[PDB]
Design a protein around this ligand. Structure first.
Ligand code: NA
Ligand code: NA
Ligand code: NA
Ligand code: NA
Length: 327
DNA sequence: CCGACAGCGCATCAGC
DNA sequence: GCTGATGCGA
DNA sequence: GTCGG
């Protein structure tokens, strides 16, 4: 990976613009265009000398090449400088860091004078359940989770799930499964032999047990197949308590389980390249199933999958260790 | 020139 | 009461 | 904003 020093000024500039498109202008596609440009530039192993040079990279077009030229010659971007100083826009952009507060809620809050966390604290009744929790753990939620804590967190989840019913199968995915040194949250996929695509408390019993042992502390949303909440490792003797963490738990039918583990294990880059290689071989792979694309294009029924490898086999690909799925 | 850029669970809104 | 749409997330 | 039919 190229050192941040190479084009960090440029990548930082593109990422800030991305946030403003997403959070203020509500232009999600522009948001992603910037992110895509920032990503391709972030992996470019050379210090960019001009916009034209950058334009050769996929995802970098005329407008961004133009912005790069301005930043190389001035060390900044007038539009970015201006929006940063804009009280309304910087406040809308900032409020979106609260989990539960999106571009719409952020805009509404700022419209009525609520611009800071302090304002949010004085207006609890104007926040829904999710937002109050995002506010309560604002700092904790932005902190990363060291792998050691992730292992401790896994120990608890795996233990409690098996305690509820030894037949449950639980897999912690995300970058953690790929061996990451830290994580932004914990993503748990859960299944049970009694639950197939064609077979109401399976998920509830697990969440309940996790709350019973005081691991899960709050709930953002909870249905029959998906749970999104907060957890916290138990504090040690006289030791500073651990920060609260975001944890999601999805209940997936057995026959769609491994397609789910693969997908949620990523990385996204790997998922694309795998979805690509998948198509050229006559297959389509999403998070639910792998299906054979017919002669005219009639995707027959989903193929049977009993493991990640099963999927790799259908596309003539040597099973890839989560460790080697960065792309 | 102009459409795609992912699809979907849950919470909550808009409206009958 | 309900259905469908919208906001939000990851 | 960028790509591509
Ligand atoms: Na380009
Ligand atoms: Na947010
Ligand atoms: Na956010
Ligand atoms: Na048992």
């Amino acid at each position: 990976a190229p050192q941040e020093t190479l084009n960090g000024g440029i990548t930082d500039m593109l990422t800030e613009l991305a946030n403003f498109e997403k959070n203020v202008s509500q232009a999600i596609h522009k948001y992603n265009a910037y992110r895509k440009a920032a990503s391709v530039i972030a992996k470019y192993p050379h210090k960019i000398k001009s916009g034209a040079e950058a334009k050769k990279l996929p995802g970098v077009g005329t407008k961004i090449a133009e912005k790069i030229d301005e930043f190389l010659a001035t060390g900044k971007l007038r539009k970015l400088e201006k929006i940063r100083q804009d009280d309304t826009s910087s406040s809308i952009n900032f409020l979106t860091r609260v989990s539960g507060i999106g571009p719409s809620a952020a805009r509404k809050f700022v419209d009525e004078g609520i611009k800071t966390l302090e304002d949010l604290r004085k207006n609890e009744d104007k926040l829904n359940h999710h937002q109050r929790i995002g506010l309560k753990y604002f700092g904790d939620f932005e902190k990363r989770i060291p792998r050691e804590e992730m292992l401790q967190m896994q120990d608890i989840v795996l233990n409690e799930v098996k305690k509820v019913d030894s037949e449950y199968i639980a897999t912690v995915c995300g970058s953690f499964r790929r061996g990451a040194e830290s994580s932004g949250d914990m993503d748990v996929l859960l299944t049970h032999p009694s639950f197939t695509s064609e077979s109401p408390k399976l998920l509830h019993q697990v969440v309940e047990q996790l709350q019973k042992v005081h691991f899960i502390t709050d709930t953002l949303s909870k249905g029959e197949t998906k749970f999104m909440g907060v957890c916290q490792l138990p504090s040690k003797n006289d030791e500073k308590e651990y920060p609260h963490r975001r944890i999601d738990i999805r209940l997936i039918p057995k026959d769609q389980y491994y397609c789910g583990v693969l997908y949620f294990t990523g990385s996204d880059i790997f998922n694309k390249n795998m979805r690509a290689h998948a198509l050229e071989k006559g297959f389509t792979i999403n998070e639910y199933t792998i299906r054979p694309l017919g002669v005219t294009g009639v995707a027959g029924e989903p193929l049977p999958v009993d493991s990640e490898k099963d999927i790799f086999d259908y596309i003539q690909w040597k099973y890839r260790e989560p460790k080697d799925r960065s792309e």
